[PDB]
Amino acid sequence: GLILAFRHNPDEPDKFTVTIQTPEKAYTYRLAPYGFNNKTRRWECLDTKYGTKRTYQADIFVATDEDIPESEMTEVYGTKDYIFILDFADLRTGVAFNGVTINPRNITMISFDCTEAHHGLGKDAYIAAMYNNDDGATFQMEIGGIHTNAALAAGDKLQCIWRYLDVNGNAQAAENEFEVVSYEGFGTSNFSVKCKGMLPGKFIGCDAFYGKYLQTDGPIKQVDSVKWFTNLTVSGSGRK
Amino acid sequence: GLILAFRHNPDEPDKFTVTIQTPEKAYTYRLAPYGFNNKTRRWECLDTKYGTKRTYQADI
Amino acid sequence: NAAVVPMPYSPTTVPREQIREIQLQLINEMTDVHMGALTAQYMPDDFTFEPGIGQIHFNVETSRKVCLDLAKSVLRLVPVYPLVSPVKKQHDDYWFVGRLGLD
Amino acid sequence: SCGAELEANALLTALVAGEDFTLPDIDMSGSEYDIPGGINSPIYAEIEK
Amino acid sequence: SCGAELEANALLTALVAGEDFTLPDIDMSGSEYDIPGGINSPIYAEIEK
Amino acid sequence: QDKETGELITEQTVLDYPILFAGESQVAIHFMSGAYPDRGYDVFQKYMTETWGINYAGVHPINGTTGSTAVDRACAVNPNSEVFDPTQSSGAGGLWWWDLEADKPGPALLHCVGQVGKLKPKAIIWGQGDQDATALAYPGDRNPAPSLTRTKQATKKVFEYLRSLYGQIPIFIQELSYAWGITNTDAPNVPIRTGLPSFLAARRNTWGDIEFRWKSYGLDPALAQYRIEIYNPSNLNQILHSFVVSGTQEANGYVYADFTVEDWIPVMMEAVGSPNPWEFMKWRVVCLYQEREIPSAPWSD
């Protein structure tokens, strides 16, 4: 019975996530940015493709403290004025909100995943193509746009949203994770990663990719930044 | 709730059998050979005529 | 025979040649190389028929050949990879150390 | 054409004249004829075992 | 041809003129008209003896 | 820092090599209508990377093409409307790359820039003249009548505008290809077939004789027979006179048939009781190869 709204300036606003530590495991929840539609006077998710498809009234957020400076806030979907809404009654996991729903009756902590832009493979990482190997235990993945200092190792987990052509000839979209076994091409910004699993069809295109939490450590140009959490507004039927 | 998998070299692999001694009698069970189909990445019985018609994952 | 033609007549076949001259003369008066690929050797059999419209678009195979010609044209201008990373050796050939700073 | 629809209107009015046939006027688009408690109702909330 | 469909439209409008027949507009594709708790719901979880 | 040398590396960078694709839908066919690796741009990325020795992800082409787009509002389908609708649904406005009247980039050009986004391309592939060709062939009532100078100037400066947003990168142009419209409107389900008559020509002399000329497609006209159909001047949908002309009736690089004064006067009598001259004519030629009829486009000039 609680809803939390605030303003933040992450490096990857479309990929901003929050981890919830239930006494069972560590679920991950994605906070899609919300923009205030003026004509309907309601808060709507900016992500029209893989958003929450939820609307909230203007009362859910009230601004009293000093707002985040514009120059310190990134732009997503052509807009810099956006807020993140956390609803405990719609805690759907998954990158595209297709995962299991978290039970909000037992939560031990709520951790925000603040990270730098060049974290992991980098902000500019993208997938070129995917195809299954002739071997019956793995498949190949091509990744580009990787910063030079990045390194990869076996056992890493990668989240990706991609569209594939079904065996019936109709287009299909699905999301899942992959496990890294080996890769080639260190330092050339192009990786030929071999991963386990099976592809249910021919690759068409990729919509999302994270490539975070790499086992191997790497240097980065030192830079200092300030993370802002402004106007934390809490409302709902639960005890406040 | 248990599954056992192994490799063996009997003289008659299609006729390999295992006896189970229940407290009632001595049942006989036949272990048909299983081959790993590469295209579907699953273990399938090689006997297509009188096999178990069962599929198992590679993790088994 | 001289009475047969390989290309059926179209009302717009003349302006397409006229525009082709405009593009061709533009290449010769610019700085960079602007000749992508040749498509004048393709016949109506190289086009997918659409009912009620005609044959306007290339086949998947014919367009594939066009892309291959585009790749060769760019490679002639740029024969080698122009970019180079700061690192050269494998990950096993570099130490990972921390410093107080450059100075 | 030829005023075919005009003739039908005149005949229908005269033949069925002398009796009341006012249909009820009810708006089903109102909130009364809709279940309250939209997508945010506890009805749509997931049931826990 | 010969404006056959045009004649039908004119006749239908005139004959049934004078009464309201607005059909309800309801979107069944929304989440309200769909059962919550997708493939990850405990409903699809295997029942243990 | 290296194992054997003490130099310090502390800066990261990306070696992406984007390539920009923009223009008419004739280039859009490379990305659409298929999947990996059967798509056109897949082979372009495959062949290019192998030659350079880099991985498959070294080249990153970007699609910014749009179907039925013009270089200027003059050739646009809807010069007046501004709303952008690449799908041609509802109001098919915009769809022009540049507006030479106001010297302003068009919505189609802005859409291509939006596709590029953060990436910095190093090569441009262009092709567009499909829409300008048909518009120039039919000027219509468009007050800014299409012209070569307008097309040249719009195409000249649109490249400069792209060169303004990015570096002085080379740009390659795909030459304009041919396109054939449908032959018969009453039969919208038949494609172009071999033996189809084409290049219909009509000629006359001062005496009054009429000559019909056409050229065969895909086969020797001397091997197949032909038949000429002439429609009634009064009822254009009803055939009036017809005759069969055999093969080898070809000269001067054309297949000719003779329709002289002594031929059309007898057929004119039933229509009009006087030998009125035949200034106007509508006629069609149908091939008779392997007992198959292949009617051609009508000639009504």
Author numbering:
A (entry chain LA): 122 to 361
B (entry chain LB): 122 to 181
C (entry chain SA): 3 to 105
D (entry chain TA), E (entry chain TB): 2 to 50
F (entry chain LA): 422 to 722
Text lifted from the article:
N4-like phages have a genome size of about 75 kb, nearly twice that of T7, and encode around 70–90 ORFs, including a characteristic large virion-associated RNA polymerase (vRNAP) unique to this family of bacterial viruses. The massive 3,500-residue vRNAP 18,19, present in 4 ± 1 copies inside the mature virion 20, is ejected into the host upon infection. In this study, we use a complementary top-down and bottom-up approach by determining the cryo-EM structures of both the full-length recombinantly expressed vRNAP and the fully asymmetric N4 virion tail.
We purified N4 virions to homogeneity and determined the high-resolution structure of phage N4 tails from filled virions (FV) and empty particles (EP) to 3.2 Å and 3.6 Å, respectively. The tail has a total vertical length of 450 Å, formed by the HT-adapter (gp67), tail tube (gp54), and tail plug (gp53), and is attached to the head through interactions between the HT-adapter and the portal (gp59). Surrounding the tail is a six-fold symmetric non-contractile sheath formed from a heterodimer of the minor subunit gp64 and the major subunit gp65 22. Tails from EPs are remarkably similar in structure to FVs, and comparison of the similarly resolved maps identified three critical differences after the genome is ejected from the capsid. First, the portal undergoes two major changes: the collapse of the barrel helices beyond residue 667 20 and the narrowing of the portal tunnel from 33 Å to 25 Å due to restructuring of the tunnel loop. Second, the ejection protein gp51, which forms a α-helical hairpin adjacent to the wingtip domain of the portal, disappears in the empty virions. Third, we identified 12 fragments of approximately 16 residues inside the lumen of the HT-adaptor, which are absent in EP, comprising the N-terminus of the ejection protein gp52 16. Interestingly, the tail tube appeared sealed in both the full and empty particles. Surprisingly, both the N4 mature virion and empty particle have a density for the tail plug, suggesting that the plug is not lost in the environment after receptor binding but remains tethered to the tail complex, available for reattachment after ejection proteins and DNA have been released.
